[PDB]
Write a protein that binds this ligand. Structure first.
Ligand SMILES: [Br-]
Length: 534
């Protein structure tokens, strides 16, 4: 008499409006078994009209008792079967066609980690929706957001259950009144579908993560974890066997490497350590030391080796960044101390959730003395300080944390929250994302940001630059910084931004245990070229 009308789930779009998450119509035939005269005769009559198989009966027979107590006689119907039922409606008074919506992901595994998936509501979801006091709003709703955007914006994408006053027999005949459902709100993402597809291609067979951001907005133009899987098979109610196949793959397709991969950031951190050392005044632009290719922990027999076996010689910070000198940063770490260095890296967001609008995230670890006492029950030694100076030791970060620290550097200490939401459709208007956070590290006019970035310019462009090979011929100027994180094979890391002059793209990439094939600087150049040439 008064019944719930399920609202349709909001759609998800890329930055140009390409649909990424769609609803499809599934037609099924339904009746109330009691309100039927000759059920067993009626079913035999339906065989020819909607191609009703023995298995359509079996699956209905199994449902009639299992149902507390309408049941699906046949599910799914072809339009042809619906059309043959509709002209024979008068012959089956107690039987109607019902239209339902099932989520569809047309680019599948290219966007599994970003978009996620919706899955069938289970007892645990029911309990939790009860506790939250919104279970009535899920009365006609089958699926809910379990990963990615589908999860983080579940409340935006779901909408409002409506009500209809209807008359029966025992199938609906007409509608007395209707309180419309309000459709879920559509979400437009910052994602560039073309860039995303292109990057999943480049990573093929690598365990990898890439984050591409626009540093003027903090919008995420691409977010790739490789290896991936088909999100569609979770809408289909994933089997135990398929889930276990995913859960036990050693490549770990289930893990979003971009937001849950925790790795040593290695030498990618040296630009932020420079800015911090300069701002704390522990060095100046000019502060020079001589590198013989190793460094003695002063007052102790520990030797720390530079990557360059016979050293870089006389280094200022600029040259230490261009050549990725370890010796210069071992000194800077020693002088700064863990307390000031941990505190400054925390300002860059290391050890912190980034604020990205996904619920699948790890914070990693910006080590402190307090933390080491707490976790490992020993106190902090000078030994512990030194590897932290080159982004190793207890220091772990996510690719999304590395993307955020770079955006902060590009914007001279003005922090952008990385974000996937470009706009929400509210009442037929696209309402843009607005950053709520307004953090500022040191002073915008310090010119210390510039020293660190001129360093990175040098890595890419100057003949002593460690990355000069990857960026030969560019019509734009790129700024970059690489790193190698050992654990068999070392992880390879690069961060980069372009036009150096006025950056419109920044990239953070890690190839786990090196590239399956290509080098991280090859891949970074291919990404910057894709966006800035074409
Ligand atoms: Br609707």
């Amino acid at each position: 008499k008064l019944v719930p009308i399920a609202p349709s789930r909001g759609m998800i779009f890329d930055r140009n409006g390409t649909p990424l998450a769609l609803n499809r119509t599934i037609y099924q035939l339904e009746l109330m078994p009691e309100k039927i005269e000759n059920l067993s005769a009626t079913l035999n009559a339906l065989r020819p009209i909607v191609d009703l198989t023995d298995d359509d009966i079996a699956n209905f027979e199994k449902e009639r008792k299992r149902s507390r107590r309408s049941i699906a006689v046949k599910t799914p119907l072809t339009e042809v079967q619906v059309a043959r039922f509709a002209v024979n409606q008068f012959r089956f008074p107690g039987i109607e066609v019902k239209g339902y919506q099932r989520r569809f992901y047309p680019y599948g595994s290219a966007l599994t980690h970003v978009i996620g998936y919706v899955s069938k509501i289970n007892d645990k979801d029911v309990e939790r929706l009860d506790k939250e006091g919104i279970l009535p709003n899920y009365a006609a709703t089958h699926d809910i957001g379990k990963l990615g955007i589908e999860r983080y914006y579940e409340s935006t994408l779901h909408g409002k259950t409506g009500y209809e006053e209807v008359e029966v027999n025992g199938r609906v005949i007409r509608q007395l009144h209707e309180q419309p459902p309000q459709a879920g709100k559509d979400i437009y993402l910052t994602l560039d579908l073309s860039l995303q597809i292109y990057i999943e291609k480049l990573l093929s067979g690598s365990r990898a993560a890439v984050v591409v951001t626009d540093p003027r907005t903090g919008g995420i133009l691409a977010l790739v974890s490789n290896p991936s899987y088909d999100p569609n098979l979770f809408v289909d109610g994933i089997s135990n066997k398929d889930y276990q196949g995913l859960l036990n793959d050693t490549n770990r397709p289930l893990i979003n490497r971009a937001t849950q991969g925790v790795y040593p950031p290695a030498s990618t951190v040296k630009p932020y350590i420079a800015v911090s050392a300069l701002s704390a005044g522990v060095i100046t632009k000019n502060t020079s030391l001589f590198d013989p290719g190793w460094w003695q922990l002063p007052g102790s027999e520990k030797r720390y080796r530079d990557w360059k076996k016979w050293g870089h010689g006389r280094l200022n910070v600029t040259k230490a960044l261009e050549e990725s000198a370890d010796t210069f940063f071992y000194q800077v770490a020693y002088d700064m101390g863990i307390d000031r260095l941990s505190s400054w890296m925390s300002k860059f967001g290391y050890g912190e959730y980034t604020g990205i609008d996904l619920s699948e995230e790890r914070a990693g670890l910006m080590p402190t003395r307090e933390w080491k006492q707490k976790r490992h029950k020993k106190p902090w030694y000078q030994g512990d300080t030194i590897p932290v100076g080159i982004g190793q030791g207890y220091w772990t970060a996510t690719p999304i944390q590395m993307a955020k620290s770079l955006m902060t550097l590009i914007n001279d200490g003005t922090v952008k929250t990385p974000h996937l939401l470009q706009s929400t459709r509210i009442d037929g208007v696209l309402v843009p994302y607005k950053q709520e956070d307004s953090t500022q590290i040191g002073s915008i006019n310090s010119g210390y940001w510039e020293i660190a970035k001129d360093g990175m310019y040098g890595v890419a462009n100057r003949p002593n630059g460690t990355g000069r090979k990857f960026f030969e011929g560019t019509p734009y100027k790129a700024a970059a910084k690489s790193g190698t994180a050992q654990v068999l094979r070392d992880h390879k890391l690069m961060v980069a931004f372009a036009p150096y002059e006025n950056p419109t793209v920044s990239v953070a990439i890690i190839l786990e245990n090196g590239g399956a094939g290509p080098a991280v600087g090859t891949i970074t150049r291919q990404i910057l070229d894709h966006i800035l040439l074409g």
